[PDB]
Amino acid sequence: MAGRSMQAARCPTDELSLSNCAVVSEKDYQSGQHVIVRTSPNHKYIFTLRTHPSVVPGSVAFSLPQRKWAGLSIGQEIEVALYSFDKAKQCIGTMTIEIDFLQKKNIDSNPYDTDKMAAEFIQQFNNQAFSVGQQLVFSFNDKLFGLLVKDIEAMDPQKIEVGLVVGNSQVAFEKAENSSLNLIGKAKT
Amino acid sequence: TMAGRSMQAARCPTDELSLSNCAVVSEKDYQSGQHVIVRTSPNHKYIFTLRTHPSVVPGSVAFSLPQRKWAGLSIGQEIEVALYSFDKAKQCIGTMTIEIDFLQKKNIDSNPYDTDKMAAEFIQQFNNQAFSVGQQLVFSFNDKLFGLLVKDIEAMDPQKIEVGLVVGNSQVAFEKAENSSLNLIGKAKT
Amino acid sequence: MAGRSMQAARCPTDELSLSNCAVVSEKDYQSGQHVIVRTSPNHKYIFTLRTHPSVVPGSVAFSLPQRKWAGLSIGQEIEVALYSFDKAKQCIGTMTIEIDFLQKKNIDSNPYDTDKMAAEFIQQFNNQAFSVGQQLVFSFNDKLFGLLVKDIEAMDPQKIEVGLVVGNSQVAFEKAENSSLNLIGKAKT
Predict the structure, then answer these.
(1) Domains and their CATH numbers in chain C
(2) What is the dihedral of CA C160, C165, C170, C172, to 10 degrees?
(3) How close does chain A come to B2, measured CA to CA in Å?
């Protein structure tokens, strides 16, 4: 009893990509459900869903970052099944994220408070699934940043591949090599 | 009291939305999936399937240019809207013939198109939506946009119908428009 | 009994601004609820909500006109609490609105019927909250107009600062000084 066959589609809008959710039709799923997307015998990527009116029923919309991360191409047939988080080990305890300005062009020398970023990160991504290596778009203080999940650990009653962000998940940031990003605060690696 | 409700025809919020071929409304007036009969004037009624979107002004119904052309509507035009119910076997689509062509003169490649693959996806995205003979639609397939014209529709015989509901076993047959460079293939043709 | 701290965000699209609602994540609120946005210790603003998939959880999206009116800047922290209309005095009896073309480039000499405008205004804004001094965007006959709430009065069993538009609320328009706007109809000042 595998998942259903669907097609990868492009993201309806740029703003939507800030969600880092796989976007779907309300006819197929409801927001908040999680899915495991099988692209081949070598990969099963986990996404958290969010509905949008423009998504064609039978398709799943992905932003550019997600398509790169998941090695997806528009039109591609994918196998999709509901994924359930139901074990303590799956909740994220700590997670390390590599950050940098999205547009290598726009780069300010202003100092950014990581503790503030960590709090907002937890706020907008609460109950969403993340995996080591995943690339995301993060909107902070009206600026766009690129994020790379470097590590994830569960709460010791350690290392996990994928996990659910919860209210007490700890996020530590660190700029990418050669980054002109000045990070301040205690939410730094 | 029994007749429909008075509303205004509005523009479609986005291009992407037009791929749905649904009349788009406010979640304040309707819920997605309901069907409506839109009266423009005596002797002229058009049936649409609804889909909500946050940007639609309450009291208005959004239509894409092609829908407005077909229903002969103009922006701001006042219309009479009433819920329409499909509840008779004769209304389910058995077979439907569609004339296809690239939506844009621009992109016009000569590659092959499996009418069987298109038919399946058509049924997939338009399941439970209403279509009428003569209706013009926008169809997204393989990252390419095509224009569709509903030529004929027939009900199942336990024939010819004006409007019907697409269901899981509805059969769709395609046929390119005259002078079309559409390289159709497969067994889903007229 | 305080509200929750959130951040002001940009409006996902231009079309959304026609709603004049504060837009939110379906994860935080449901459409139709009303909120009081405390921007500072002496100022609280009232908005009616509408959900949209692109709004980042933990944030509230506002159009430029709304940000100007409530003195908000993007990323700004705000305290948000549900607001309840539950007293007769809060229902709008009459309201005076100053109207003008939204943009210079869109100026013309066509006649716009106030009675028609009033009816459509009540139609699209029914059950939404408005305050004296609030500036809105109004779409009428495929044209965009700027609106300024000049006055609001309750039904005498008078003057109120904020109120809920209901089915029998009366709206009177008047053009801005020097407005080349051509207003007809009886729903005037």
Answers:
(1) 1-83 (2.40.40.20), 84-189 (3.10.330.10)
(2) 70
(3) 30
